[PDB]
Amino acid sequence: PLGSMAEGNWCLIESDPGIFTEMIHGFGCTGLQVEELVVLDESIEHLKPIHGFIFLFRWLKKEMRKEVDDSPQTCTDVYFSQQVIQNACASQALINLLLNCDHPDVDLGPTLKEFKDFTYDLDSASRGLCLTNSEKIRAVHNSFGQKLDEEDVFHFVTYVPVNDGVYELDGLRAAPLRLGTVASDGDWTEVAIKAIKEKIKNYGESEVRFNLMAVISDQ
Amino acid sequence: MQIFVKTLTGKTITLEVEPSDTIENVKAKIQDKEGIPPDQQRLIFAGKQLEDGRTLSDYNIQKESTLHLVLRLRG
Numbered sequence A: 001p002l003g004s005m006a007e008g009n010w011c012l013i014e015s016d017p018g019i020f021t022e023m024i025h026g027f028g029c030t031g032l033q034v035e036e037l038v039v040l041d042e043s044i045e046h047l048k049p050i051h052g053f054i055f056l057f058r059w060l061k062k063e064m065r066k067e068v069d070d071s072p073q074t075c076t077d078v079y080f081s082q083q084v085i086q087n088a089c090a091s092q093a094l095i096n097l098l099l100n101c102d103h104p105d106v107d108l109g110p111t112l113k114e115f116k117d118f119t120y121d122l123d124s125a126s127r128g129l130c131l132t133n134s135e136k137i138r139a140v141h142n143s144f145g146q147k148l149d150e151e152d153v154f155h156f157v158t159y160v161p162v163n164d165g166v167y168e169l170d171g172l173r174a175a176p177l178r179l180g181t182v183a184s185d186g187d188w189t190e191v192a193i194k195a196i197k198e199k200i201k202n203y204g205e206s207e208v209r210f211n212l213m214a215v216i217s218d219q
Numbered sequence B: 001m002q003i004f005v006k007t008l009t010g011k012t013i014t015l016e017v018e019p020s021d022t023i024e025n026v027k028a029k030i031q032d033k034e035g036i037p038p039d040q041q042r043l044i045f046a047g048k049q050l051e052d053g054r055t056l057s058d059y060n061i062q063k064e065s066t067l068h069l070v071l072r073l074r075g
């Protein structure tokens, strides 16, 4: 119902790390870049600190039956905007990632900072409509540019650590999915990579249409 | 000659190719095996993204070389 107030069309975005880097900059944020993982468990020590992953996959209806957490931290700790329109997923995934950063290498810039400040206390669905109707964000998105029911749509989601938890931010959902607790001396990326491998098991061994990117400190 | 093309998920696609094949010809063979259109494919050898009009031999790709394939899919 909220989609009825969504204004303008959004283009699809190619899963290219150069493009996601330029989108971060176009939104006004500095200090970060995006690097592609060529193999899922390739060595990534030289990438660290990794601030989040962006994972693309062909969306399957069985995603609807995913069991999610009822942890209190999902409510208290995590910024999340739900999509109101389908084609915004690349920007929605990226902004869900960035608005959960607090790190000395990250500067969101005044546009995303004020956007976060405005939407931080709104319901996730309203946060999403606000994103969708932002002419600044939509402009940047489109400058770089389909029925779920038929399972031929490629979807972007985000993986990010917040406090002691690691979260999958999938903008089709009403809330983040808390995947598990990391550490105190653990590696948050292992929890995300595990979840990504679990999703890959939803398919046959002959599905190869995936892309994985890491958002890292600029180098 | 044989070359091996690996993927994110660990799959290996084996191809029969000539040293004088173009990158574009290689992408076409992968579409034959895997059904991915060449426009959604980027091929990587030694950390270099391989350009369509060049040949395997331009890149020093030899008998039994391994390349990687990463996807450029519109989401």
Ligand SMILES: *NC[C@H](*)CC(=O)OC
Residues within 6 Å of the ligand: A012, A013, A059, A083, A085, A086, A087, A088, A089, A090, A148, A153, A154, A155, A156, A172, B074, B075
């Ligand atoms: N690739 C555009 C976004 C797709 C999407 O929302 O899939 C669920």
Ligand code: NA
Residues within 6 Å of the ligand: A102, A103, A104, A105, A106, A107
């Ligand atoms: Na910061």
